[PDB]
Design a protein around this nucleic acid. Structure first.
Lengths: 149, 129, 185, 83, 83
RNA sequence: UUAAAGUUGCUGCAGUUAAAAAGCUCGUAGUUGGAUCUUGGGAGCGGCCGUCCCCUGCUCGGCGCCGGCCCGAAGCGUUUACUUUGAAAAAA
RNA sequence: GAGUACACCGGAAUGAUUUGGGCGUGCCCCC
């Protein structure tokens, strides 16, 4: 089940078996990549880029119109973010919880959630360190929140 | 978390055979499972089995007729030599006339009798009778 | 011409005739608008099950995407050229031996035998796609691959099952059947 | 029970079961081709859009984000496109 | 069982369920040996020959004996294929 | 002091009520980790299968032939456990 | 050619004449 909560769940995507682009999709690869570049320049993340492309443009997912994934394409062009999106979201959530905790010191549940979130951050940062994407001297620190917005 | 697909497949097929079902599907598929089912079919214990392919992991349906008492797994994969085969098979099999023990070998995943015939050893996988 | 071979080998009369016929057809029909540099690799003739013969055409991998819009009418033109001869367009891909610890760059998964076999199977049937694969293992340990093809566009390739099976068996060595379901479309 | 046919289940049985418990994993979602009598250009949308969409041509808001499908704006025709 | 010559030392061969392929013990009173008579195709008449079935006590106890008998009669050629 | 002791349980013991699951969670060591990279044919010893060769390449020579070819080698080969083998392994 | 389901044409068919449209390929309007 969930890594921290004791709840068990089953809800995620289910890709189809047929690995072929549908015939009704007239969009090529070049224009899809152009739209991806435009959305990246607008200031979005690969989490929402696929959502927008599968909602408005009607493409199922990128991995069939092209070969490289969204993050792969962003890395190829070079405007990909320097920090992973999920780690950024976890850091932002931790900062929000700490900002809530600075004033209200009696909210024990907030302290517990902050501890759990910092644990998740450490566990993900260890994998990033061992997969050679962050410097070995990179460390998550409690006070360092303004720089890592 | 599933730590051994083979152990779960053996437990599931054992439960299905004990209840009295005619066929059962195994969610995870691996090459060693296919080899072990092939060993059973060559020894004449189960029937035709159908591997079903998807783009994530296959599924296997086995025609169990009547001939399995139980069929199980030994973990971890203990390494056994030729001189230790007799000690394992005396205290692992119900008798000496029938029953087989399979073990991985660089010459092929085979039963204990064939391993003795080809004069080789390896790592024990399980047993069936 | 159009046929290009790896080494300086003289193609047999059949391959030269096929290349010349394809050149004449593209010059005559309205396909030369997109068939100038689109060349052919090689060709073969076999004997499939029954009193018919099949034609095998090899395809360069990068330029297959340009071919993908052509097989709609090219096979019909070849059938008009030879009635009792079936023509199929299949890609030719390179296979590398498994890196045994006695025998250098990394071997990509695109060149492995499994990927090559899957590509051959999925390119042998161009009009109808693949719904699912169900391999049956005989009592003797032999396999029997069954492939489910798309129910749509079925009234033009339902008679090609025998030549598909023959070509795939001769190129690979596996017994393959073909069936059509209806529970989805 | 004891003697079923898991190789060839009836379509009713397969559609009864969950999407990830079927014999092969297949989503139950699909794409749409929504259009309105106002504008005369046709767009392509996803069933579970979960995002507000504006018709290309600034006509009106077409879909609505909900828990499951999308609340199509009244006065719109859609068809199930498939291959 | 065999020996040097090839004769049989087992003093009796036990029965075996026609459905679950499980043998029937001596002190198993729940086992049933059922006889089903066939009908000639020409007019419909009793001829004299019969077909014999056997179901172990476990199947009846769990409650799947009737389905097994139906399957056996369908396979032998008694119950209509369309059914 | 050993077997009886499946009452020290690695094979191979127990934990609701007889002895026994930390009040709960996170967590560094330690332990355990999903699927997938290799395949078939050719010839043959024979009555499907008992049995056979093939799937690491690149300066010096003798089973030899009539400048053309193999043969052996002073010189290498991703690393480990596993498995079979040989040597080295005092006597009683 | 941007509005509709419409007006000009070209490939193409049998010296000459040519068959209602929309892009959501199968259903939506016109009679």
């Amino acid at each position: 089940g969930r890594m921290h909560a004791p709840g068990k769940g089953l809800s995620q995507s289910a890709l189809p078996y047929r690995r072929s682009v549908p015939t009704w999709l007239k969009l090529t690869s070049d224009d899809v990549k152009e739209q991806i570049y435009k959305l990246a320049k607008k200031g979005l993340t690969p989490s929402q880029i696929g959502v927008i492309l599968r909602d408005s443009h009607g493409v199922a997912q990128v991995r069939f119109v092209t070969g490289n994934k969204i993050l792969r394409i962003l890395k190829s062009k070079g405007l990909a973010p320097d920090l992973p999106e999920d780690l950024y979201h976890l850091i932002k959530k931790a900062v929000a919880v700490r900002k809530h905790l600075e004033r209200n010191r009696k909210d024990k549940d907030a302290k517990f959630r902050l501890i759990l979130i910092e644990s998740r951050i450490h566990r993900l940062a260890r994998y990033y360190k061992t997969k050679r994407v962050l410097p070995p001297n990179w460390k998550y620190e409690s006070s360092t929140a303004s720089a890592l917005v | 978390v599933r730590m051994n697909v083979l152990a779960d497949a053996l437990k599931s097929i054992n439960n299905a055979e004990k209840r009295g079902k005619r066929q059962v599907l195994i969610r995870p598929c691996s090459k060693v499972i296919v080899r072990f089912l092939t060993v059973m079919m060559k020894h004449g214990y189960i029937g035709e089995f159908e591997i079903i392919d998807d783009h994530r992991a296959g599924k296997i349906v086995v025609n169990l007729t009547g001939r399995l008492n139980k069929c199980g797994v030994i973990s971890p994969r203990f390494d056994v030599q030729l001189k230790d085969l007799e000690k394992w098979q005396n205290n692992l099999l119900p008798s000496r006339q029938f029953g087989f023990i399979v073990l991985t070998t660089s010459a092929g995943i085979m039963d204990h009798e064939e391993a003795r015939r080809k004069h080789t050893g390896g790592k024990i996988l399980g047993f069936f009778f | 011409a159009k046929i290009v071979k790896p080494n300086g080998e003289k193609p047999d009369e059949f391959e030269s005739g096929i290349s010349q016929a394809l050149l004449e057809l593209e010059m005559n029909s309205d396909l030369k608008a997109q068939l100038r540099e689109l060349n052919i690799t090689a060709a073969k003739e076999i004997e499939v099950g029954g009193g018919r013969k099949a034609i095998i055409i090899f395809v360069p991998v990068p330029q297959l995407k340009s071919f993908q819009k052509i097989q709609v009418r090219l096979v019909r033109e070849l059938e008009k050229k030879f009635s009792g001869k079936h023509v199929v367009f299949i890609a030719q891909r390179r296979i590398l031996p498994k890196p045994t610890r006695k025998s250098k760059q990394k071997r990509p998964r695109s060149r492995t035998l499994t990927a090559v076999h899957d590509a051959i199977l999925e390119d042998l049937v161009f009009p109808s796609e693949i719904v699912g694969k169900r391999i049956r293992v005989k009592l003797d340990g032999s396999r029997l691959i069954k492939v489910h093809l798309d129910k749509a566009q079925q009234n033009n390739v339902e008679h090609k099952v025998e030549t598909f099976s023959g070509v795939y068996k001769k190129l690979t060595g596996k017994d393959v059947n073909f069936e059509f379901p209806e529970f989805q479309l | 029970p004891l003697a079923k046919d898991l190789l060839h289940p009836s379509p009713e049985e397969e559609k009864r079961k969950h999407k990830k418990k079927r014999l092969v994993q297949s989503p139950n979602s699909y794409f749409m081709d929504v259009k309105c009598p106002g504008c005369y250009k046709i767009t392509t949308v996803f069933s579970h859009a979960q995002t507000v969409v504006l018709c290309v041509g600034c006509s009106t808001v077409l879909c609505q984000p909900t828990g499951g499908k999308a609340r199509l704006t009244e006065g719109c025709s859609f068809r199930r496109k498939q291959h | 069982m065999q020996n040097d010559a090839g004769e049989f030392v087992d003093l009796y061969v036990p029965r075996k369920c026609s459905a679950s392929n499980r043998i029937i013990g001596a002190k198993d009173h729940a086992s049933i040996q059922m006889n089903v008579a066939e009908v000639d195709k020409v007019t419909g008449r009793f001829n004299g020959q019969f077909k014999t079935y056997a179901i172990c006590g476990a199947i009846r106890r769990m409650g799947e004996s009737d389905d097994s008998i139906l399957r056996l009669a369908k396979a032998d050629g008694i119950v209509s294929k369309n059914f």
